[PDB]
Design an enzyme around this catalytic site. Structure first.
Site, short mmCIF file in Angstrom:
data_model
loop_
_atom_site.label_atom_id
_atom_site.label_comp_id
_atom_site.label_asym_id
_atom_site.label_seq_id
_atom_site.Cartn_x
_atom_site.Cartn_y
_atom_site.Cartn_z
N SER A 41 -6.66 8.43 -8.68
CA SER A 41 -6.72 9.72 -7.98
C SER A 41 -5.70 10.76 -8.43
O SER A 41 -5.72 11.87 -7.92
CB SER A 41 -6.51 9.55 -6.50
OG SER A 41 -7.65 8.83 -5.95
N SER A 99 -6.45 12.31 -0.58
CA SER A 99 -7.03 11.71 -1.75
C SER A 99 -8.56 11.54 -1.63
O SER A 99 -9.15 10.55 -2.10
CB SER A 99 -6.38 10.39 -2.07
OG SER A 99 -6.46 10.17 -3.46
N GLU A 139 -15.58 9.93 -9.14
CA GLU A 139 -15.23 8.88 -8.19
C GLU A 139 -16.52 8.18 -7.71
O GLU A 139 -17.50 8.85 -7.47
CB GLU A 139 -14.55 9.48 -6.95
CG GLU A 139 -13.15 9.95 -7.17
CD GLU A 139 -12.13 8.91 -7.30
OE1 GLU A 139 -10.86 9.20 -7.45
OE2 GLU A 139 -12.47 7.70 -7.35
N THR A 208 -0.93 10.58 -5.18
CA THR A 208 -1.04 9.14 -5.48
C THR A 208 -2.29 8.85 -6.28
O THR A 208 -3.23 9.68 -6.41
CB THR A 208 -1.06 8.30 -4.16
OG1 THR A 208 -2.13 8.79 -3.41
CG2 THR A 208 0.24 8.48 -3.40
N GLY A 209 -2.38 7.61 -6.77
CA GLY A 209 -3.68 7.07 -7.24
C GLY A 209 -3.67 5.58 -7.17
O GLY A 209 -2.59 4.97 -7.35
N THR A 210 -4.82 5.00 -6.86
CA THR A 210 -4.96 3.55 -6.66
C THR A 210 -6.33 3.17 -7.20
O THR A 210 -7.29 3.92 -7.04
CB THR A 210 -4.81 3.19 -5.17
OG1 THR A 210 -3.62 3.76 -4.65
CG2 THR A 210 -4.74 1.65 -4.99
#
Length: 272
Positions: A41, A99, A139, A208-210
């Site tokens: 993200s 996000s 996504e 953030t990104g996950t």
């Protein structure tokens, strides 16, 4: 410092990437800084900048309608507004602060049309002089490429230098820069990552990104108590656990704490 980062890798069975650009008074902090890591993200921040840049502020008011069928990723805010739509401004807010993946996919379509949004987003980065990063999927597919695949990747070096231009440089005019900055300042998803590594009197903004393979990232701009800015990119994965490897936020908090310790520590010389 490299020895400290390597110990984090061992303890978390992870690969870690860190970049903090040099300043007039601090050396760069670089660990795997030119290795590729999936964006996850983190792309949503420069995506908002791309949409801001290309349009007047009045475009923020444009209502976008979508359906339950467009919701194919974690989308905390888009699920709440599915029946009434969201404005471009509301999509930017969501994409950053929650996000939101649907918000991001809608912004990609706003930027490049239905077929063209990932290319167009990549092209925004190219317009900033980043020849390294690339986005290939939307996504949630962009979280799923295997380790080593260059698709959907950036580097700690590339993403930090992009974020530096957007927030600290002149990539955006001031009013648009301020919107981006405030959305990242009020992010809700990053308490356990870079923010956790900095003392409370430092201002932190982040995205953030996950993802799969234990991917966990965070990109930030921080300001010392007297307003001196730095950029911090921390990226990680845990490919040895396979596709459903557990991400470990505390790895990012620890890498950020290492960074903050160096940035905050002053070096007055003693009398002799």
């Amino acid at each position: 410092l490299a020895d400290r980062f390597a110990e984090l890798e061992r303890r978390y069975d992870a690969r870690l990437g860190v970049y903090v650009p040099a300043t007039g008074t601090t050396a760069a902090i670089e660990y795997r800084a030119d290795e590729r890591f999936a964006f996850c993200s983190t792309f949503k921040a420069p995506l908002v900048a791309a949409v801001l840049h290309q349009n007047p502020l009045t475009h923020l008011d444009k209502l976008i309608t979508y359906t339950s069928d467009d919701i194919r990723s974690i989308s905390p805010v888009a699920q709440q507004h599915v029946q009434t739509g969201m404005t471009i401004g509301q999509l930017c807010d969501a994409a950053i602060r929650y996000s939101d993946g649907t918000a991001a996919n809608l912004l990609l379509a706003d930027l490049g049309g239905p077929g063209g949004g990932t290319a167009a987003f990549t092209g925004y980065l190219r317009s900033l002089g980043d020849t390294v990063s690339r986005l290939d999927a939307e996504e949630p597919e962009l979280n799923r490429d295997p380790p080593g695949d260059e698709r959907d990747t950036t580097t700690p070096h590339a993403i930090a230098l992009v974020l530096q231009q957007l927030v600290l440089g002149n990539a955006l005019p001031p009013d648009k820069r301020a919107l981006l900055t405030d959305w990242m300042a009020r992010n809700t998803t990053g308490a356990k990552r870079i923010r956790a590594g900095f003392p409370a009197d430092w201002k932190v903004i982040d995205k953030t990104g996950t993802g799969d393979y234990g991917r966990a990232n965070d990109i930030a701009v921080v300001w010392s108590p007297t307003g001196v800015p730095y950029v911090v990119a921390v990226m990680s994965d845990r490919a040895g656990g396979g596709y459903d490897a557990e991400p470990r936020e505390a790895l990012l908090a620890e890498a950020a704490t290492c960074v903050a310790g160096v940035l905050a520590l002053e070096h007055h010389h003693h009398h002799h």
